[PDB]
Amino acid sequence: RPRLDLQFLQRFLQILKVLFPSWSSQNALMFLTLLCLTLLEQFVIYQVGLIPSQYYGVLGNKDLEGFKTLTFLAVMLIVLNSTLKSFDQFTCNLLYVSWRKDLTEHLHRLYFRGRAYYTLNVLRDDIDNPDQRISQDVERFCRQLSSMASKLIISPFTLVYYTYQCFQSTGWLGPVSIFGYFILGTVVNKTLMGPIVMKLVHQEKLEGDFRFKHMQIRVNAEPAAFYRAGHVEHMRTDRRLQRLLQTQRELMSKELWLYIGINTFDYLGSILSYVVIAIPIFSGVYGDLSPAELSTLVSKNAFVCIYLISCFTQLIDLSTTLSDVAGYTHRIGQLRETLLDMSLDTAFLLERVSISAPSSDKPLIKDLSLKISEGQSLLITGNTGTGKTSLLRVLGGLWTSTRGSVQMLTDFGPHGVLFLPQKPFFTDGTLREQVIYPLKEVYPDSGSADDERILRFLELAGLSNLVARTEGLDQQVDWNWYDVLSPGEMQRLSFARLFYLQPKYAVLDQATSALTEEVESELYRIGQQLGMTFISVGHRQSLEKFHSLVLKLCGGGRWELMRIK
Amino acid sequence: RPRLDLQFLQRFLQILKVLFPSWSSQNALMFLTLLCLTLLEQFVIYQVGLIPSQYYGVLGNKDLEGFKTLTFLAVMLIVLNSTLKSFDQFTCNLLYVSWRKDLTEHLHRLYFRGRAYYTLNVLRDDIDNPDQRISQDVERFCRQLSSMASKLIISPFTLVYYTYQCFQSTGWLGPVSIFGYFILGTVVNKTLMGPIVMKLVHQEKLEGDFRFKHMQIRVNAEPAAFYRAGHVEHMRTDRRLQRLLQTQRELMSKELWLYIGINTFDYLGSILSYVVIAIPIFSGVYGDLSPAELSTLVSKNAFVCIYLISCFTQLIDLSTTLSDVAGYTHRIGQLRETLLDMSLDTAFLLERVSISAPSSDKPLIKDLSLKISEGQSLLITGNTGTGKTSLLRVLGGLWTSTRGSVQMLTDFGPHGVLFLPQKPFFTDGTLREQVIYPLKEVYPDSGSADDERILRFLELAGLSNLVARTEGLDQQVDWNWYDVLSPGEMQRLSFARLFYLQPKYAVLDQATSALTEEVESELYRIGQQLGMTFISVGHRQSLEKFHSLVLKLCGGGRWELMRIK
């Protein structure tokens, strides 16, 4: 599928439509000072190309004061040739920084659009590692594009000037025997960069699946070392490593032919200008002199045609770094393609709803005629895998019902409806950010300076000994918030998140790892004290005093609304 | 700290001691066919450098049959110049593959040594992203080393031959004015590659912390999208992105000077051979002729000294790709340094044990006089964060007691002692591998062909409907085993892992998200039926019928051994 086709150009142009969004952008005005910099350095390189030629004239007669103006002209030209070549290398690397800022942030608006970070990771197998496409492949495309962004910018000009310099030396049978050397030179690459990209996207999945294998160790270091699983996870990660090293070694077995088809074009290009001028030795249609029509004509013709291929083998010298780019735009363009179409009182109403697991066909629950009002706070207890949570997912817009109508009558927000997941979430950030987490900032939201509400609610949830652990509410705790915290207090920090953003309906789920009558009840006592109406999931014989309904689910689609008292 | 010092060489040589382990290795014998390949191509490049010179002689007299042997000699030399240059580029990229196979697998033996994946990730802040050092920085060091492994291998020779060619043309005042141009040329880089590496390791932490930020989204897509946290995690990940893009842009502001100090050395090197021969125009100690001693002497001297700097500016042309290498060996050498010193009946005995959290000072538990025998299976119930699990960590060798003596009298294994973590673990692999997980293979271990034991235990744990979900016990399920599974059946798959590897002592922990009398008791009924003696953690009013002791922990170090009946 990633086969360098005519599809790749739309995957490349729609990438380039956001790298360069419009004229007078932060990249096009960095590109115009890239064109007008290699244009200036092409004048200087030729001008410093004349300095050793006009050096023998002043050394050939030994006048130091007439020499001191030449070196001073040369050294001024050298530090002009440097700071034009160095600023050519810099503003490409400033373009590489300002490309991946404009492409990742374009991908971030697509990745966190509504729920597209959810659906790619748990509901899609076509797009394997979207973390690797956004982080590394944008970094690796924008580097391999910027390395060839200094030679794809002067080659629109230095090919034009040298073809004019060649047309005035050979004629109609001149540069079209070099343009025909490009058409043969790039067809022999476009059929040879084929199995590169097919073995590079496959090299990029396995370099991303291996990196995710290490972050199934870094995120899960605490459970894995309980099993003493060093000698297991070695033979699991090396199995992930060898599959990468048997497709990185496979890429070099394919890129060997790409190195051949470039080095053949380069070195035979040093002699193909000479066989253009086989027309004396095969035809001789302008045969006038043996030492003068033959010598210093072809020495004038090879001095201009090798001068042409010197700016024309550049476009094939980067066929490796365009096979790399075409490998990465078949990763990023595989991602923003699937992200673009993916962008397309009385808590909730459920009308004959038939939720199933996404892989299988049988429904987890069969028919729902469900309605939640203020002060109801129904339990959703049941069996182990009967789809207790799968009701809650379609309330959060996670899944869609196969056959049924689901809607909510209250908006998501602080005082609206707030979910709590089964395994809890904690982002990187301060303790102040871990509790207002769906709101991400509170001082423009609230306006009140004092945040004594959360310092109340932390001790009200009981974990005020954590505040001394995180040294106040300061930035960059440098924690993982998963291994350093505790599932006893992951729930309590999730409850302080719920207590801060007290809704008209909480969609609380699995408040376990807390004492069933001592603090599981006490965390629920703040719910009626704040008027929360928490629709909860829990198979514990303490929740029924807080909950009106029961909603058993024992079976492949069951209803059993009980209203215990 | 990463400042290109004399420490860096020991961090580079101890890396190179394992890239090249000994002579006749899989890399040194790939390096000897790299030396003996650029040596062969240096002869060919000079031999094909004579083909256009001896071309005007046969074109200057128009003999096609005497010409047809030249092009046939040339094209044979071109396809010899290609497949020596291309095999030079290939066997470097085969060296890059076979370097990162030998360096990652050296790092994997250090990473999963005893518990070093645990201690780096949850007990260390000095080594931030060891996933990025092992995966990406070994890949990025071994690529930036292999790109300069084709020019650091011929430069021991082509510098020798050209200095001999220069000593026979200028003398004592010749190449030591070029060797002095290297000593100035590399001191002006060794003081300029300083702030590159200091801003590249900092560029590599933030490129690794950002990639881990995406895998705190990919691993946690299910809880984060319950909060509708797209508009939050955008402004969290972009905050992680902008900190990378304000230090990648900072690197280009520092690498601009490194591009200057190379392009100044290169282009002034085109004229510094000429100012070596200021000794006619300043001294004139061999002044004999004006047109003949002055011309075609320096034209012979610039034809050999620029010929020398052509092989001598290569060693400074790669000062960028050695600033990159020195950035990455201060990442890998920061890692294998901290990994090398890190390598240094009656279940357990606890003698006055005073476990604390690693950051704080106060002990979670104060004094332990504890002993576990067969058929005891004590509960460890208590408060939410009083260090219930912290007793279990030192039993697994995770933590060490601050003051106390801990030991075990039974080895870890199938029939020995087996832990279960609070949050459960599932590696990538088949369902057969998810249940024998601390053993990683069973058919050399067991020998028996039929594995009806696990198909018994899965339905005995109840989750035999999972076997149809994973299509048998086949390889590469392509799942995450965390989002696709369920915390109801994460426990049940952990229990089938415990039932397969039935120990004399299970160190079970938090068998929650299962029905307290229906299947939490039923999973424990297989424990006495298999004779497991499971020391467990759980604050539920059903576990006490299976458990002898209680071991309350209500407070900052408490004992309360009760032995309920």
Ligand SMILES: Nc1ncnc2c1ncn2[C@@H]1O[C@H](COP(=O)(O)OP(=O)(O)OP(=O)(O)O)[C@@H](O)[C@H]1O
């Ligand atoms: N994201 C998913 N992708 C694919 N299959 C899934 C996914 N989530 C769940 N499933 C499948 O469908 C079932 C639904 O389980 P569900 O989410 O209802 O968990 P539960 O154990 O009932 O709830 P809880 O653990 O919160 O008590 C899972 O056991 C699994 O087989």
Ligand SMILES: Nc1ncnc2c1ncn2[C@@H]1O[C@H](COP(=O)(O)OP(=O)(O)OP(=O)(O)O)[C@@H](O)[C@H]1O
């Ligand atoms: N790996 C760690 N690094 C630093 N601090 C830690 C780490 N693990 C725990 N802590 C700190 O020490 C405390 C010890 O908690 P512990 O592991 O005993 O959890 P618990 O809630 O008692 O157990 P459980 O959740 O299994 O019932 C944590 O609350 C936290 O403050």
